[PDB]
A paper describes a structure:
In summary, the sequence alignment and the photocycle measurements confirm that MAR is a member of the PR family, which functions as an outward proton pump at neutral and high pH. Overall, MAR consists of seven transmembrane helices, A to G, connected through short intracellular and extracellular loops. A retinal chromophore is covalently bound to Lys200 of helix G. The fold of the MAR is similar to that of other PRs.
Using the rose-form crystals, we obtained two different structures of the O state: under the proton-pumping (pH 8.4) and pumping-inhibited (pH 4.6) conditions at the 1.4- and 1.09-Å resolutions, respectively. We will refer to these structures as the O* and O states for clarity. At the same time, the extracellular part of MAR turns into an almost fully dehydrated region because of the FG-loop closure (a key role in this process is the formation of a hinge in helix F). Apparently, the O state is trapped by the crystallization conditions in the rose-colored crystals. Fortunately, the O intermediate state of PRs harbors a retinylidene Schiff base with an all-trans retinal, allowing it to be trapped in the dark under certain crystallization conditions. Glu83 and w6 acquire two conformations. In the first conformation, Glu83 makes an H-bond with Ser41 and w6. w6 is stabilized by Ser41 and w5.
Author numbering: 1 to 217
The structure:
Amino acid sequence: MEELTYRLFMVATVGMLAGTVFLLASSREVKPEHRRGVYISALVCGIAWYHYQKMGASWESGSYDTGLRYVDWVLTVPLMFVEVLAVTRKGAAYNEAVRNWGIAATVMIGAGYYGETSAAGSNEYWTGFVIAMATYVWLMRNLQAEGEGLKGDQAVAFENIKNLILVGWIIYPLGYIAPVVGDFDAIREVLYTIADIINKVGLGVLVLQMARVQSGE
Ligand SMILES: *C/C=C(C)/C=C/C=C(C)/C=C/C1=C(C)CCCC1(C)C
C-alpha cells in the first residue's frame, strides 16, 4: 500500500500538469467569450500540480503532511464553484452564490482538517466529519437546484457538470473514513488522489465541453 500510494502521487502530479496544459492548448477551440471557465479550470489543475509535487515528496519522506492536501482544497474548491455558477448566474445572483458557497466550502474543508488531524475515531475526528458532512450536503442540495430551468444542449452539458460533482465528490468522505474501516491510512490518501484527478481534470474537460456548446458547436 505505501508504494502504491507513492506511485499514485507521482502519476497524479504529471496528470495535473497534463490537465493544466491540455486545457490551455484547448482554449483556442472555443470562442473567446467562453474561454474564462477553461482558463480557471487550467488554474485549478495548475495549483493542484504545485501541491501534488509537494505531497509526493512529503509521502515519500515517511512524515506526510495532509495540510498540503487541505490547503490545495481550500484554494481550488471556490474556483470550481466560480466556474459552475457562471453558467447559471451573473451580477447579483452570481456574487451571492459564489460568496455563500465559498464560505460553506471553507467551513467544510476546515472542519475536515480539524477532524483528520485529531486522533482517528475520537470525538474530535467525528465532530469534524459531521460538520463537514452537513456543509457538504448543503452545498450538494444547492448544486442540484442550480440550472433546473435550462433546456437543450446547454442543459445536458450543465447536468454533466453537476453529476460529476454530485457523484465524484462522494469519494472524499469515503477516504476520510477509510482509516476507521481497516488498517487503511494509506487508502485514505489513495482515494483523495484518485478523487482529485477525476474531479479536477474531469471538471475541466466538462467545462471545455460546456464552452464548445456555448460557442455553438
Ligand atoms: C479539488 C478538490 C476537491 C473538489 C475537494 C473536495 C473535498 C471535499 C468535498 C471534502 C469533503 C469532506 C467531507 C464531506 C467529510 C470529511 C471531511 C472532508 C473535508 C474530506
